[PDB]
Symmetry: C4
Subunit: 210 residues, 4 copies
C-alpha cells in the first residue's frame, strides 16, 4: 500500500501526459490505456468496520466521473480522465515528505504545464489552418516539407519547443505568432509563465540551500 | 453602503482600461461611460453636516475635476477621467486585507501598465504613419493586409502582445523597433519591466504565503 | 557642504556620460567642459590629493583619445559614499544610474567595435543602414548611438529583440562578454534592489 | 599544501576545458576513450569544502562552472550540428550563409565562437535570433538547454545575491 500511492502517482502522471496528446494530435496503443484504467478501477475498489460512508462523502463521486468509460469525435469525451489529478492533489502531504520529492514534483508540473500549453497551441494552429499566416505553414516552409506537410512528430516537437521558449523567456524567433488568436494565446502564456516561473524558481532557489 | 467600495473599484478599473484605449485608438459605447459618470457623481455626492467641511478642503478638488464634463480637443480632454485612480490610491487600506485581493491587484496593475504602454506604442506608431519603416507597415505586410491596412482589433492585439513580450523580456522577433522614437520607447519599457519584475514579481512565493 | 557634494556627484555623472561618448562617436561643447574643469579645480582647492591631480591634468598640445583619463572622477564619488548610502530612494536612483552608465559604456564599446570593421553586408552597421533605409556615409550619429544603446539595453535585459544581432567573430565575442557581465551585474544590482525594496 | 590545491584545481579546469573541445572539434576513436578524464573533477568536488572559505572564491568558482557548462554544451551542440551536416536544414549551413563563406565553409574558430555564443544566449534566456534550431534533434537539445540554463541561473545568482548581502 505504501508503494501503491507512488504507483498511482506515476499512473496519473502518465495519463496527464498522454490524454491531451491523444485528444489534440492523434484524433484525425490502447493496451496501456486499458491497463491503466483497470489499475485505477482496482484502486477505487481497494479504497472502498464500514468506512464506506466516509468514502461517499464528496470524495468518491469525483473519482467515479473519472473512472467510467465512454464506449457506446469521442476523444473529447475520454478527455474527462484528467480529473484523476485530484487524487494526487488530495495527498500532497504524503508526497512532500522530502525536499528532493518537492523538486521532482516542481519539475514534473512545469513540464506538464508546458506540454498542456503545447497541445493547446497545436489545436489553435490546427483548427484555423483550413481557412500563409498560420505557424504550421511557417514550420512547413522552414524545414524541407512544404504543406501532406510535416509529420506529427515534427509538429509536436516544434510546439513543445515554442512553449518552452515562451515560458523560459528565450523568444527564439524561429516560431513567432502571427494570427490574432495566436497572439492572445501568447499573452495568456506570458501571464501563466510569469506566475509559474516566478513561484517555481523562487521555491527551488529556497530549496537548494536547505 | 459598504459593498459600494468594491463597485467603485471595479468602475475605476473599467475607466482606467477604456479611457486610454478610446483616446489612443478611437480618436480617428457612450451609454456605459455615461452610466459610470453618473455613478461617480452619485459617489461624490455620497462622500458628503460636520463631515462635509472635512474633505471640502481635502480630496474634493481632484474628485470634482475628474467628474466635471467637457461636452460642448474634447476627446483629448476626456482623458481627465484618469484622476479616478486616486480613489483606489487613497482607499488602499480596505483593498489589502487578503492575499487573494493583493494578487488580484497585482495582476490588474500589471495588465493596466501593459495596456497603457500598448496605447502609447500605438500612438507613436500612428504619429509616425505619414512619414515600411514603421511597425504598422510591417504588421500590415506580415498579416497579409498591405497598406486600408490592419483593422483596429489587429493593431490593438499586436500592440498589447509586443508590450507584454518586451515587459516580460521574451522578445518574440515578429514586431521589432525600427525608428528612433520606437527604440527609445523600447528602452523605457525594458527598464519599466525589469523594475516591475525585480520589485514585485520576485519572492512571489513569499507574497502568496501571506 | 552637502549641496557641494551633490553638485560634484552630478558633474561626475555628466563627465562619465560625455567622455566615452565623445571619444567613441565624436572623435573623427568645449565651453561646458572648461567650466566643469575649472569647477573641479576650485573643488579640489576648497577640499583643503594625488588621485585628483592625475585626473585633472589639462591636456594641451591623440588629445581626444587621451582625454579618457578624466574618467577617474568616480572614485571621488566612491570615497563620499556615506552620505549617498542613506535612507530613501537615493540608493535605488544611483543603482539605476550606474546600470544605465554601464549600458552607455557598453554601447560606446559596441560602436567602437562596429566602426573598426566598417571599411573592411557583414556587421551591425551595414544591417542598420539597410533597415532604416540609409544604405552605406549612412546612418547619422544619432541613429547609430540610439541603435547601439538599444541593442546594449536589450542584451543586458535579455530581451533579445532580434533586430540587431552580432554577425562577426569580434561582435560574437563581445556579446559573450556582455552576457557574462550582464549576468553578474543583473544578479548583483537586482538582488540588492529587490532587498532594498522591503523598506 | 595550500598552493598545491589551487594548482591542481587549475589543471583540472584546463583538462575539463580541453578534452571535450578536442573530442568534438579536432576529431580529424582514441579521443573518445581519452574523454574519461572528465571524472577527475571528483577531487575538486570533494575539496569544494576547502574551496568554500570566502565568498569571492565561491563566486569565482560559480562563474568558472558556468563557463564550463557553456563550453560543454557548445561542444555537444557542435557535435549535433556536425553529425547532420553531411546529410539548408541545420545551423551550420545557415551560419555559413550568414558570415559569408558558403558550405570549405566556416573555419573551426568561427564554428566554435558561434556555438559558444548560441549556447550562452540560450543559457541566459536572450534568444538573439541570429541562429535558431531547425531540426528535431536541435529542438530537443535547445529544450534541454533552456531548462539547465534557467536552473543554473536560479542557483548561481541566488548564491550571488546571498554573498552580496554578506
Ligand atoms: C545577460 O545576462 C543576464 C542574465 C540574467 C538575466 C535575467 C533573466 N531572467 C530574469 C527574469 C526575466 N523574466 C521576467 N521578466 C519579467 C517581468 C515582469 C514579470 C515577470 C518577469 N519575468 C519572469 C518571467 C520569465 C519568463 C516568462 F515567460 C514569464 C515571466 C528574464 C529571465 C538577464 C540578463
Amino acid at each position: 500500500k505504501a508503494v501503491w500511492d507512488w504507483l498511482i502517482l506515476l499512473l496519473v502522471i502518465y495519463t496527464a501526459v498522454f490524454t491531451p496528446y491523444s485528444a489534440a494530435f492523434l484524433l484525425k496503443l490502447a493496451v496501456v490505456d486499458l491497463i491503466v484504467d483497470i489499475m485505477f478501477i482496482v484502486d477505487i475498489l481497494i479504497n472502498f468496520g464500514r468506512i464506506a460512508v466516509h468514502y461517499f462523502k464528496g470524495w468518491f463521486l469525483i473519482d467515479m466521473v473519472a473512472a467510467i468509460p465512454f464506449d457506446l469525435l469521442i476523444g473529447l469525451l475520454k478527455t474527462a480522465r484528467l480529473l484523476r489529478l485530484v487524487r494526487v492533489a488530495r495527498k500532497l502531504d504524503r508526497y512532500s515528505e522530502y525536499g528532493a520529492a518537492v523538486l521532482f514534483l516542481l519539475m514534473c508540473t512545469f513540464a506538464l504545464i508546458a506540454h498542456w500549453l503545447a497541445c493547446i497551441w497545436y489545436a489553435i494552429g490546427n483548427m484555423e489552418q483550413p481557412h500563409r499566416i498560420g505557424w504550421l505553414h511557417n514550420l512547413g516552409d522552414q524545414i524541407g516539407k512544404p504543406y501532406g506537410g510535416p509529420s506529427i512528430k515534427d509538429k509536436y516537437v516544434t510546439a513543445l519547443y515554442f512553449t518552452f521558449s515562451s515560458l523560459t523567456s528565450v523568444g527564439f524567433g524561429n516560431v513567432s505568432p502571427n494570427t490574432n488568436s495566436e497572439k492572445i494565446f501568447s499573452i495568456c502564456v506570458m501571464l501563466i509563465g510569469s506566475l509559474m516561473y516566478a513561484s517555481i524558481f523562487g521555491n527551488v532557489s529556497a530549496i537548494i540551500q536547505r
